Structures are given as C-alpha cells and as structure tokens.
RNA sequence: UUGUAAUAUU
C-alpha cells in the first residue's frame, strides 16, 4: 500500500531524513501516522522557502488532508505559521465545505484553526455558510466548537444569525450539553443588543434553569459576569424559593452563587429569608442544616454574611447543636461554626 | 474522607 520510501521511513531506515528528500511524497506522508508527525516537526524548523515546497503539494488535495485523521495537523500548521497568500489559498479550498467540515471530527479542527488566523473578510465569508445550520452545529459534538470559535474570533456583527437562530431556543439549548457552553460564549462576546434577547429568555425560565444539570451553569455565569440588573432579577427569583432550591442538587449551587454575588443588601435579605422561614415544626434553617445539599448553602451564608448577621445566624443554630450531631450532614455545620467560635 | 458540568483528533 505505502511507498518503499514511506515503509522504509516507518522502519527507521532514515535517521537523517529531510523535507527535501520527500518531495513528491508529501500527500502520502501527511496521511501516515509517523509521516504526519515527521512533517509537523520538520515544518516547525523549516525556512519559509522549505515550507512552500511542502505547501505546493498539500494545496491541490487540501480537502482530502483536512478531513484526515493525521493530515488535518499538516493543514493547521500552515494556518499557524503560513504566509498570507498560503492562508488565503487554503481558505479558498475550504470555501463551500465549511458546514460539512464543521460537522466532522478532523475537519472541524481545521475550521477552528482557520477562523483564528485568516483575515476578517475571510472569516465573514466562512461563517455565512453556517447560516441556516446553527442549531445543527450547536447540538453537534464537533460542530459546537466551530460555533464557539466563531463567537470568540469573528466580528460580532457577522453573527446576527446565531442570535436570530437562538430566538425561542434559549431554554432548549441552555439545558443541552453543548448548547449551554455556546450560551456561555454568547454572554461573554456578542454585543449588548445581541445578548439582550438571550438574557430576556433566560429571565423567563430562571426557576426551571437553576434546577437543570446544565441550565444552572448559565444562570451562575450571569451571576458571576453579568450586569447588576441581571444579577438582581435572578436573586429575586431565587428569593422566596431558597428552602426548596437549597435542597436541590443542581440549584443549590445557584443559591450559593446568589449569596456570593448579590448586593450586600440582597445577600442580607436572602440570609434573612432562611432565618425567618418556618418549614412546619422547626425552622427552614434546621431542615437545611441536615440536608445533603443545603448544608453547603448554610455554610456559604456563614462565610459571606457581614459579621453582625453571621452572629445572629450562629446564635440561631445553637439550640439545635445536640440534634445536629445525630444527622449525617450536621457535622459539617458544626465544623463550620467551630471555625468562628 | 458530604454535592453538578462537553468521552470533542496524532
């Protein structure tokens, strides 16, 4: 199958092998496991002139190498360290294949690499081909990364269609394993008038989103990085739901995050809520102190409360210390209290 | 010795 030259190379019959010596075998070498690594390493220390000799052969069947397990690496090397003309010639080779490459395990890596190192006008050409196929890519294990790289590297103006695709889909994709990460890149990069519709749908579903295994991360992203107004809407939804949401595997992390990033006044109001709520027989606090998730929340409130409110809370916990030692998760409240005592 | 993130390529 291979060439004597490639078989001989695989069987270490060439310790002094140079790129010059494999002219005419570049394609075949690029598709070989060792051949590819050989080319990748020699190219790192090749003069611009030597790199061009290689490029001449990789150009014609560029597509064939882009979708190849090993050949994709040789292509990306050229986006990383190539002349402008080489990078344009490769972007010209990608033209009309963006989507099919994006949805492919190796091809997608070439695309991501290209977005990072081609000129803005060329990025804009490349991304146009994703228009109509956003959801397909976002849901895709490989494609979703191409989309994230678009958001990171491309002028936000060129991506209105991403936003437009997400309209009515925010909830669906904030609860999707790959869509949630895409939402998190949008909140980070896309313009205010572009996040605006995204934030609107998030606020409409926050109670539900905090209880999702992925959604909860979206809501916490806003609590950590968003505008004060956004943070406020979120804490307000959480507030009045602290007791139940504190006992929920997923949303319990969101109540902690609200406790950390809420205004001093908001934080105090949330801590006050659990202090004054009475879940039947005993306090909502008591319920939380023996719960598997909420014990964390209570400890969090202890660490972030202003000293005066922390004291009140501690003193309110005191009456139940003897009981708390019997329940599995109680030890953890007591550990925390002991730090402060 | 208490609780959640994407099996993304040589």
From Swiss-Prot:
Pumilio repeat windows: 21-56, 57-92, 93-128, 129-164, 165-200, 201-236, 237-272, 276-315
The UniProt induction remark is:
Strongly down-regulated in keratinocytes upon UVB irradiation.
Q: Where are the stretches annotated Uracil-nucleotide binding in RNA target? A: 72-76, 216-220, 295-299
Q: Which branch of life, at top level?
A: Eukaryota
What does the entry state regarding organ or tissue expression?
A: Expressed in brain, heart, kidney, muscle, intestine and stomach. Not expressed in cerebellum, corpus callosum, caudate nucleus, hippocampus, medulla oblongata and putamen. Expressed in all fetal tissues tested.
Its function? Sequence-specific RNA-binding protein that acts as a post-transcriptional repressor by binding the 3'-UTR of mRNA targets. Binds to an RNA consensus sequence, the Pumilio Response Element (PRE), 5'-UGUANAUA-3', that is related to the Nanos Response Element (NRE). Mediates post-transcriptional repression of transcripts via different mechanisms: acts via direct recruitment of the CCR4-POP2-NOT deadenylase leading to translational inhibition and mRNA degradation. Also mediates deadenylation-independent repression by promoting accessibility of miRNAs.
Q: What is this protein called?
A: Pumilio homolog 1
Q: Which organism is it from?
A: Homo sapiens
| Gene label | PUM1
């Amino acid at each position: 199958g291979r060439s004597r030259l490639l078989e001989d190379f695989r069987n270490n019959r060439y310790p002094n092998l140079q790129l010059r010596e494999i002219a005419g075998h570049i394609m075949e070498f690029s598709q070989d496991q060792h051949g590819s690594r050989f080319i990748q390493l020699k190219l790192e220390r090749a003069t611009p002139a030597e790199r061009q000799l290689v490029f001449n052969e990789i150009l014609q069947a560029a597509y064939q190498l882009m979708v190849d397990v090993f050949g994709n690496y040789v292509i990306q090397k050229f986006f990383e360290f190539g002349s402008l003309e080489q990078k344009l010639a490769l972007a010209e080779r990608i033209r009309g294949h963006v989507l099919s490459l994006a949805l492919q395990m190796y091809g997608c890596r070439v695309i991501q690499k290209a977005l990072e190192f081609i000129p803005s006008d060329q990025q804009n050409e490349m991304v146009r081909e994703l228009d109509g196929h956003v959801l397909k890519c976002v849901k895709d294990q490989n494609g979703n990364h191409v989309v994230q790289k678009c958001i990171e590297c491309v002028q936000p103006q060129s991506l209105q269609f991403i936003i437009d695709a997400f309209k009515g889909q925010v909830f669906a994709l904030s609860t999707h394993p790959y869509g949630c990460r895409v939402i998190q890149r949008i909140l980070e990069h896309c313009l205010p008038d572009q996040t605006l519709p995204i934030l609107e749908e998030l606020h409409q579903h926050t109670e539900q989103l905090v209880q999702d295994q992925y959604g909860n991360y979206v809501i916490q992203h806003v609590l950590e990085h968003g505008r004060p107004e956004d943070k406020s809407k979120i804490v307000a939804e959480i507030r009045g739901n602290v007791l139940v949401l504190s006992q929920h595997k997923f949303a319990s992390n969101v109540v902690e995050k609200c406790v950390t990033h809420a205004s001093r006044t908001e934080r105090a109001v949330l801590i006050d809520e659990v202090c004054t709520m009475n879940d039947g027989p005993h306090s909502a606090l008591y319920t939380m102190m023996k719960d598997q998730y909420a014990n964390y929340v209570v400890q969090k409130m202890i660490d972030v409360a202003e000293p005066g409110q922390r004291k009140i809370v501690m003193h309110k916990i005191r009456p139940h210390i003897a009981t708390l030692r019997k329940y599995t998760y109680g030890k953890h409240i007591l550990a925390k209290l002991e730090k402060y005592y």
